Design a protein around this ligand. Structure first.
Ligand code: NI
Ligand code: NI
Ligand code: NI
Ligand code: NI
Ligand code: NI
Ligand code: NI
Ligand code: NI
Ligand code: NI
Lengths: 118, 118, 118, 118
DNA sequence: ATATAATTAGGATAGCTTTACCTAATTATTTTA
DNA sequence: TTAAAATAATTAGGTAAAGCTATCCTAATTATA
């Protein structure tokens, strides 16, 4: 479960960029282990809510709005990994898949603090 | 957003009992801010999946597995409320509403782990 | 299988009218044994290609274009039943379900003759 | 429209054999007027569904089942062509393209029936 | 070499699902007073 | 007592978000023969 799709599409597109890879639905599908039309369907919804724009080369252009939570998820995701890895002391082989869920329920306030206490 | 529906409906039925209220769809609705037909419907499915039985008095009765879950969610819910308050240091007023979300996203590993560290 | 959905939707909306019933997406889901979301998705498409229009009382209002194939299917449906019932001599118990498929592959060409020969 | 794809891919392979041609996907692509990858991927499903095996020579090997199908469609195809020509008295030039459709929609009952009547 | 004969890569559509929620009416149920 | 106030639930008819398989397609690249 993605806990939240939209956010995992935004986060993924962001990572894809960090990697110098071109964000193409083909990757989001690959990366999220989803069907091609599912991806197309959702990116369509996201495009409608002005979170992303599908370029003329199919590449996915994040709108400034989309880019923002794109970052926030990335931000909380990292924080969760630390919080999990540092203080809670859970197994590192499991810190990601856990933060992968928390990133979608962590609030800005808990974020704002976690950085203060981490 | 309930993050996870089945788990909240369960936690709630387990909360009602804890305070001597007769677990009735009528209450879940008002507790969870949902419509009567929605509630009568989600429950129906919870029954199907064999998590809760709607006894003759019209009361909801958590099957053995249903209860198991109920207790687990509660377990994590309390664990979260603590981790937040104690360590994370989040504002007590908002600690319930965060725990309300984290409870469904927290793993047993982190549970068992938090049981100690916390 | 419906061999052709759009047609079995039009044909259905027509029959419904004949029975003086009000054609609601809910009656198609019924007769066609399809999920509600499906019916809405397809009507959506049918409304996009201009075959039907959804009134303000959810009632489905065919378009003159919709109405025509609506009739044509009905018409080819009747001939197929005769053709099967009369000349081929197939079991009357199975003349419908058969015609239910042929209606969608019977050409005007064959329609025009079948009438002249039946 | 092929009405039923699998069934036309079978009748085609069965037709290629009948005339000596080596059934190769390229052949099906030409006969069915379909793209090369389309043909390659459709034949894959058929393989998975154990209808036809792709021998080393890259040739299409109808499995007993596949064969059984191919022969049925063929039967129906011929039978439909006659009924049209003989009884329906349709224009001999359009008889094939009509039969081409009725084959996938005609039942065995009608099959066995026309076997006599016709 | 060529030609074919197939892939790769990346899409699109039409059809279908189950979850999970909702508004407007009507029936039940209970209890009662 | 015994039928109205509430109380608790259905009915009826949708909605939106997620996902999925079958079918087709256009280029550009590789095999095979
Ligand atoms: Ni990570
Ligand atoms: Ni995630
Ligand atoms: Ni609490
Ligand atoms: Ni919760
Ligand atoms: Ni009929
Ligand atoms: Ni039909
Ligand atoms: Ni022929
Ligand atoms: Ni055909």
């Amino acid at each position: 479960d993605l806990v939240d799709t939209t956010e995992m599409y935004l986060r993924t597109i962001y990572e894809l960029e960090e990697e110098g890879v071109t964000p193409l639905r083909a990757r989001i599908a690959e990366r999220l282990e989803q069907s091609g039309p599912t991806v197309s369907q959702t990116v369509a919804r996201m495009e409608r809510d002005g979170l992303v724009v599908v370029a003329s080369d199919r590449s996915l252009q994040m709108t400034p709005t989309g880019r923002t939570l794109a970052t926030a998820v990335m931000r909380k995701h990292r924080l969760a990994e630390r919080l999990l890895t540092d203080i809670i002391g859970l197994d590192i082989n499991k810190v990601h898949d856990e933060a992968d869920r928390w990133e979608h329920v962590m609030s800005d306030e808990v974020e704002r603090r976690l950085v203060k206490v981490l």
